[PDB]
Design a protein around this ligand. Sequence first.
Ligand SMILES: [Zn+2]
Ligand SMILES: [Zn+2]
Ligand SMILES: [Zn+2]
Ligand SMILES: [Zn+2]
Ligand SMILES: [Zn+2]
Lengths: 48, 49, 94, 49, 248, 101, 276, 48, 98, 148
Amino acid sequence: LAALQKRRELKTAGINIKITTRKKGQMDYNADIPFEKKPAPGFYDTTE
Amino acid sequence: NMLNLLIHRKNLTYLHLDYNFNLKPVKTLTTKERKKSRFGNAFHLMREI
Amino acid sequence: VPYTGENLARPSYGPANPFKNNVLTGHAEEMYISEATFRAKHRAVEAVGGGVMRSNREMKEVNKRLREMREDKGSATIADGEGAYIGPWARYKR
Amino acid sequence: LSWSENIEDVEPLEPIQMELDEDEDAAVYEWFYDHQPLIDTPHVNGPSY
Amino acid sequence: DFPSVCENCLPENPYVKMLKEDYGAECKLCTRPFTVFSWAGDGRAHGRKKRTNICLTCARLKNACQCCIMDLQFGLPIVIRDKALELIAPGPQSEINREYFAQNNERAIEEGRAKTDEKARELLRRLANSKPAALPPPGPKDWLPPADKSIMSLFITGIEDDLPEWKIRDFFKQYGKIKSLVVSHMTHCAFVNYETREGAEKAATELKGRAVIAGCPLRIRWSIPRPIGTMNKEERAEMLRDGRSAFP
Amino acid sequence: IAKFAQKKKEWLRMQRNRFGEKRKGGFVETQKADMPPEHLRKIVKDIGDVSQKKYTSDKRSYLGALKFMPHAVLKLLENMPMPWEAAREVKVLYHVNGCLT
Amino acid sequence: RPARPQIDPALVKSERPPQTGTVFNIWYNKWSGGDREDKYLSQTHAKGRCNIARDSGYTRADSRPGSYFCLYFARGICPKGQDCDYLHRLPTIHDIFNPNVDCFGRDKFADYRDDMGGVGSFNRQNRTIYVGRIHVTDDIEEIVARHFAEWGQIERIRVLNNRGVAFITYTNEANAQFAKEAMAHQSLDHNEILNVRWATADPNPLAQKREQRRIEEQAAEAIRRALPAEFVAEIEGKDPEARKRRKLESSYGLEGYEAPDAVHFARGPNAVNPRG
Amino acid sequence: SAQMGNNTKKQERIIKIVERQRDPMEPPKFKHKKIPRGPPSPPPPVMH
Amino acid sequence: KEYQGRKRREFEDYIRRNRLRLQNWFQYAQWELEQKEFARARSIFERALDVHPNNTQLWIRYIEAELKNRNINHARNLLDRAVTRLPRVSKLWYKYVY
Amino acid sequence: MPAIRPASKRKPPPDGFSDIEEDLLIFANKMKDAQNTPTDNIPKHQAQWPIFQIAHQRSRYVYELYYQKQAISKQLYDWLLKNGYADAMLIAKWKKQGYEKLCCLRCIQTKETNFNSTCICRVPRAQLKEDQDIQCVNCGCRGCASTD
RNA sequence: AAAAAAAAA
Ligand SMILES: [Zn+2]
Ligand SMILES: [Zn+2]
Ligand SMILES: [Zn+2]
Ligand SMILES: [Zn+2]
Ligand SMILES: [Zn+2]
């Protein structure tokens, strides 16, 4: 909460710095769907 | 030069290997430095040979 | 055997689809040929002046002329200085 | 030590050799302390020794 | 046991000499070690040995040449293909997900289990029918040289997004040596500064406040240069129709 | 017969370049020879201790030749000069990076 | 004219970097020891600037088609000139390279870095470079325009003077990379060290829309080159002659048929079409 | 087969593939990686 | 995005710690549904089905999670797959007829 | 023996050795200077090039003095070959036909190239492209075919 | 005729 408050106070101050959230040995689950397993197609179209 | 490259590849540059093949730390080691630096019987047997 | 020559010499009936390789880009099957044949065809397509056959003597004077285009190789009995040996390492007049 | 700057042209010292008698040891006098003795003679099969 | 390489890449000679190395490099896409096939070139000037760069799994799934990594059908860079023809195969690109996806695809293909031109035609149909008080004309005051010699910027109004900068620079370099040219596309404004004031004067006399560049009508005036801020879109359309009014 | 003269030359050349008793394998094969000692001298002088960035391609191999260094120690100490020899010369097989002798 | 060597060979060699540490790691070739935070804030000015007007010229690669450019010419540090194995000249709009490589003959990665710098990525067609660390003045647009018209052929030159950061969108991959590696830590009029990275995609919906439209027009250009012009005209549906040609050709008698696209617009060895 | 554009000079090709003379002293080129196990082959019906 | 990164990291950590507890998969998929991330929710349910293929509760949860969001064609594919996988489970057949 | 003996274990060299040992000493000093050349300027592999040059030159020198003009005796020539004053295998290649201008032995070792070939320097000009800057990676020569 | 055994912004 303290870091979030400081971040929103500095973002509205004009300055914008992104910080490295990419620790080694761990995965970024937001870059793409982790270990994607798409649903199998059945007899019904699902495009729409 | 082979043993020197092995030492420097493991980022153990705080160990000096001299030209008579003695491995000595250049400074006082932390616990993590000592744990990472402990070499094996292959390195040490080759170094004494 | 799948008969002799009658079923090898006939077309399959019906029209084709109005709508088999193995590689994506094309088809490739292994083969055995003599390495000398491959070297001969590679040297034919690779070497400049390919084809355009010439007899031996004109090859002799074109090689002599290209030798004159190169600088002098040297005397090779002089160790150091002017007239020394350079041999194959002689540069080219361009 | 580099070979070129330190040992390449330096004349070596006298090795440990025994004063062979010329008359008594005349059979081995001319070849006793060669590196591979009798290598260019009909006493061996050839340079493979 | 044979690369999928287009004729653009296989050098010239139908008789080609090719080297093979097992686990010779990591795939540039899926980062897994694969068999590298490296051949020669059409010149013995740099022995680069143009080689494969992606594995046959990544070659087959994204359907591209192994060396140059462009499409086998159309010859597009593969992102251009997957973004314009759309869908087909996004493909994960992260750290562990990348080798996970490649591992599962290779495991499926080894175990047996498994319409581009149709989407090309549909792309053609999306693109064929696609579509992205007036000011007086420029008189004598807009191009007459004033008493001040520091007035150097040529203010040009009416430059659209369809107008590239190189046509402007090539059309103005015949008048003189251009010191600079800056164009604000969000404002549709242009400042042209010449290294020679004489060349700017010749351009002013030649163009006389009006220009037709690539079907684009532009109005040219003399002004002191200014920086351009976050200018409004309504005044942008005002300035556009002023540039249109330069050509009656 | 002058019409069939290029044919004779190309047929004889093809037959020799395929069945000649020097090309039993497609290429003229020789016996591997001895380099000058100064080649190895220059290589070992150039690489030094491997501290220049020029030899970054030679580092993996050099550290990998660590595996065969025991065997080099054996051959070196085996071929040592005896007390009656002021010097001895030995044939060495050396790696062209200078990694192993 | 022949290519001019820029620096004498006596200045450039393979020297060890400055001693920013206590012991030199000879595997990684880096000065280990000491602080690690000081290296992260240690940018330096370049050791020379190239100018194409007085230094470009003929070399061995100019006579060789299908060559690569000289990266050490772009930084103005190539010390041999005419006898360099790579090109010494600005790329044109016809100097098109494959996606696997950049214009300098270096392998081109699948994703960018943390600091968005280096060679590039073949996972995104990027003609736009970020040019930051610009001293704030009133005429930033003029100096950026001249110093980037020096290095090729521009399409967009967004500049934000309020904090002084520029976005320069060229027209070619080769010109973009040449401008990126030519101005790397190169000086402006003020004595500063520029930060020329690759540029992250703009969130401006217009820029996204026009970059998309560039992608579909490039794909359309390649498809129209690949397909027969008769097929392109007959599918295009703007010429009434093309429409009635389409009806009559994809009738084959049997009025009111209008054959499917998978059969009418089919290319094959036998096919049912004029083909080509 | 057909390709990106058209054909130019010759179609059929003769290719000589030889293994590359690798340095005997080189260690393995690439570090091995820890990847989670893939999904199973699709399960069968439960025929109870 | 940062909050979703935290929640995804925590949920995937607990998936990796105990993959046989169904509550981890259920809470992760429910949370991703509440974020209106439908592809991710489908992925989580499909991976849970990889770990627990013959679980009737998981099948019903994934069918109902796709029925509450009006994905009728998706849910009918799911029901065909469910009564194909588990032909002798009366609840799945009842749910499909209902 | 080609090794080094102290002072009195050295046998005398054969007759006529002074008039040629002047030039032999020139070649030895040239080889030492080639050992001492900077390598920071030229590429990495080109640093090996001068050695072979001098080696060829040294060998070729001895070759002429025994074969074209008979200026040294067979005792002196065989002594020169045995104590490493001239490459014996290179001269043995030079005496054969089609190999009279051979740069070095590594440029005909077809078992150490990728596709089992000699180097490109062993190819005549008339089949190589005009104005081609050929310079071999082994020794750095530009052409070794006997025609050239 | 070494290890246990001397701690994670
Ligand atoms: Zn791959
Ligand atoms: Zn290709
Ligand atoms: Zn040669
Ligand atoms: Zn050679
Ligand atoms: Zn050669």
